[PDB]
Each structure stands twice: as C-alpha cells, then as structure tokens.
Design an enzyme around this catalytic site. Structure first.
Site, PDB file in Angstrom:
ATOM      1  N   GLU A 125       0.846  -1.000  -0.014  1.00 39.90           N
ATOM      2  CA  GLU A 125       0.078  -0.071  -0.076  1.00 39.90           C
ATOM      3  C   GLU A 125       0.683   1.358  -0.114  1.00 39.90           C
ATOM      4  OE1 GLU A 125      -3.721  -1.716  -0.048  1.00 39.90           O
ATOM      5  OE2 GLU A 125      -3.269   0.209  -0.372  1.00 39.90           O
ATOM      6  N   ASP A 169      -6.283   6.891  -4.811  1.00 38.92           N
ATOM      7  CA  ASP A 169      -5.935   5.497  -4.899  1.00 38.92           C
ATOM      8  C   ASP A 169      -5.985   5.016  -6.599  1.00 38.92           C
ATOM      9  OD1 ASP A 169      -8.660   3.395  -3.907  1.00 38.92           O
ATOM     10  OD2 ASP A 169      -8.683   4.524  -5.612  1.00 38.92           O
ATOM     11  N   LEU A 186      -8.911   4.193   2.779  1.00 33.87           N
ATOM     12  CA  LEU A 186     -10.031   4.664   1.952  1.00 33.87           C
ATOM     13  C   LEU A 186     -10.805   5.549   2.942  1.00 33.87           C
ATOM     14  CD1 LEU A 186     -11.445   5.075  -0.556  1.00 33.87           C
ATOM     15  CD2 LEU A 186     -12.986   3.302   0.198  1.00 33.87           C
ATOM     16  N   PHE A 241      -8.389  -6.691   2.841  1.00 33.09           N
ATOM     17  CA  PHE A 241      -8.002  -5.300   3.322  1.00 33.09           C
ATOM     18  C   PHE A 241      -8.313  -4.473   2.038  1.00 33.09           C
ATOM     19  CE2 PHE A 241      -5.451  -2.509   5.917  1.00 33.09           C
ATOM     20  CZ  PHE A 241      -4.866  -1.512   4.924  1.00 33.09           C
ATOM     21  N   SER A 283     -12.293 -19.829  -6.384  1.00 36.14           N
ATOM     22  CA  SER A 283     -11.077 -19.768  -6.050  1.00 36.14           C
ATOM     23  C   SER A 283     -11.022 -20.032  -4.295  1.00 36.14           C
ATOM     24  CB  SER A 283     -10.410 -18.268  -6.001  1.00 36.14           C
ATOM     25  OG  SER A 283     -10.323 -17.741  -7.486  1.00 36.14           O
ATOM     26  N   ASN A 342      -7.025 -19.492 -11.335  1.00 37.21           N
ATOM     27  CA  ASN A 342      -8.480 -18.984 -11.353  1.00 37.21           C
ATOM     28  C   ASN A 342      -8.286 -17.274 -10.709  1.00 37.21           C
ATOM     29  OD1 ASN A 342     -11.447 -18.715  -9.767  1.00 37.21           O
ATOM     30  ND2 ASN A 342     -11.473 -19.789 -11.457  1.00 37.21           N
TER      31      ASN A 342
END
Length: 164
Positions: A11, A20, A32, A104, A117, A132
């Site tokens: 990040e 972002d 965020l 996250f 998945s 996948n």
C-alpha cells in the site's frame, strides 16, 4: 515478515490525501476515505476518523493508528463471515496473510465473491487456484500486487516479498 510489513509494501505510506488506483480519496497506509468525488467530503471523513482538524494531512503515528484499526477490522471481518471463516480456518499461517491482504484491499464482500478460488484454496489446489484468481478485474487492475498475493497463495512462502 508479517501482515503489517506485507501490507506496508503493497500500500505504501502517504501522509497527505491522495487518490488510489481507482481514483478514490485515500490516506496513510491504504486507508480509503470516501468513494465520493469531493475533496471536501474526503477532508471531512478524515477529521472524523482522526478526531482532529487535519486539513488533509496526518502524522506517521496517526497513519499507523488507522492501519492497526484496519488490519483488526479485516481479520474480524473474515472471522464473522460465513464464506470466509472456513477458508481462513483451513489455511496455513502465510496463506492466511494473503487472504487478509485481499480483504483489506477489496472488502469482505468482494473477496467472498471469488467463489471458485475460495473452494480451490480450501481444497489445497494451489496451482489451480493461482490460475483462477488471475481471471479477475483485480489481476488486470493491480497486476504487480495481485501477482505478489497470488504467488503467496501458490507457494505458501514469502518469496514474492523478499525481494521488496
């Protein structure tokens, strides 16, 4: 390596409001603020989140505090989610960190949407699951990050990050 160092690599750390990858207003370590186009709306959320008039800027300490909260909320979220908990429970420690990383970034709901998945990880079919997972907007939109996460699920080691 642990979850915090992992997410700090993915990040980054910014002390001023920024946009972002998707164009949303964000601060600190991937926190965020709002999907809203308004910078004012953003600054307002920020002050609410910190408890002070920040005028779009926070300290390192403040960034880390939001980070600790976000990581905790991600983990608690997985544990309360019926689709996610069982997968988390089935995984080894390193792979647990990779699922936390996804939650996250994309939220509980988003991750819970990767039905196929999730089944594959549960079944421990690493290669099939890696392939996948790569068939997603996620992989197309944040390719270097998605690849690191994917390799993590694939191998069960921290090699993708040992670089970084």
């Amino acid at each position: 390596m642990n979850i915090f160092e992992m997410l700090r690599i993915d990040e980054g750390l910014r002390l001023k409001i920024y946009k972002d990858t998707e164009g949303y207003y964000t601060i600190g370590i991937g926190h965020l603020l709002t999907k809203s186009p308004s910078l004012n709306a953003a600054k307002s959320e920020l002050d609410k989140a910190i408890g002070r008039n920040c005028n779009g800027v926070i300290t390192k300490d403040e960034a880390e505090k939001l980070f600790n909260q976000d990581v905790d909320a991600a983990v608690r979220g997985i544990l309360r989610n019926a689709k996610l908990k069982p997968v988390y429970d089935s995984l080894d420690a390193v792979r647990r960190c990779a699922l936390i990383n996804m939650v996250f970034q994309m939220g509980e709901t988003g991750v819970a949407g990767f039905t196929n998945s999730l089944r594959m990880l549960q079944q421990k079919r690493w290669d099939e699951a890696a392939v996948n997972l790569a068939k997603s907007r996620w992989y197309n939109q944040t390719a270097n990050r998605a690849k690191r996460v994917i390799t993590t699920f694939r191998t069960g080691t921290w090699d993708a990050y040992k670089n970084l």
